[PDB]
Ligand binder design. Structure first.
Ligand code: 31I
Ligand code: CA
Ligand code: CL
Length: 166
């Protein structure tokens, strides 16, 4: 199973301001929708609640310690192992965020879809630092910038840097 991080962040790795997107880039979201069509979306409860609704055309799986937590049109998992069990036949899952959620899935991640927005917003949560030397870029693309998507941004995808034996 391919464990993938899906993330949008600013020049300082900001991913949230008071559980909200500091930016409004509809085209970026259309990218997320396109890229994740037909795969599980893995998210923390806070992230989910900030989104506000089941996002369709895909298994929304919310991750929380809270055993009583339920929401209609979604699944709830209480641990990483619970997520893997739920997704056992899945070919690729997308960790959708909550800084802590990315941390939980960090030792299993195979693939990074990162949108970098060229700006400094005001934020309170951050995409955790990562050593990118174990990572190799395989695709890049300048996102659409216009009246509705004010900022300049780029889609990046990374896979594992393969080591060459001594
Ligand atoms: C903090 O708040 C948020 C956080 C994230 C997480 C995220 C965003 N972008 C990227 N590249 N990676 C992420 N992990 C999304 C969102 C937005 C999700 C959102 O509203 N959508 N995302 C995809 C989607 C799929 C099916 C139906 C509808 C949708 C919509 C849009 C396509 C219309 C968000 O909104 C509040
Ligand atoms: Ca792996
Ligand atoms: Cl979260």
């Amino acid at each position: 199973m391919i464990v993938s991080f899906m993330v949008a962040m600013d020049e300082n790795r900001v991913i949230g301001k008071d559980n909200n997107l500091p930016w409004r880039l509809p085209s970026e979201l259309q990218y997320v929708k396109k890229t994740t069509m037909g795969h599980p979306l893995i998210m923390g409860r806070k992230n989910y609640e900030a989104i506000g609704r089941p996002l369709p055309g895909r298994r929304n799986i919310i991750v929380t310690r809270n055993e009583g937590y339920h929401v209609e049109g979604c699944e709830v998992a209480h641990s990483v192992e619970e997520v893997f069990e739920l997704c056992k036949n899945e070919e690729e899952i997308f960790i959708f965020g909550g800084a802590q959620i990315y941390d939980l899935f960090l030792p299993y991640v195979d693939k990074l879809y990162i949108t970098k927005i060229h700006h400094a917003f005001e934020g309170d949560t951050f995409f955790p630092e990562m050593d990118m030397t174990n990572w190799k870029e395989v695709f890049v693309e300048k996102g659409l910038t216009d009246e509705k998507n004010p900022y300049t941004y780029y889609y990046h995808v990374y896979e594992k840097q393969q080591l060459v034996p001594r």
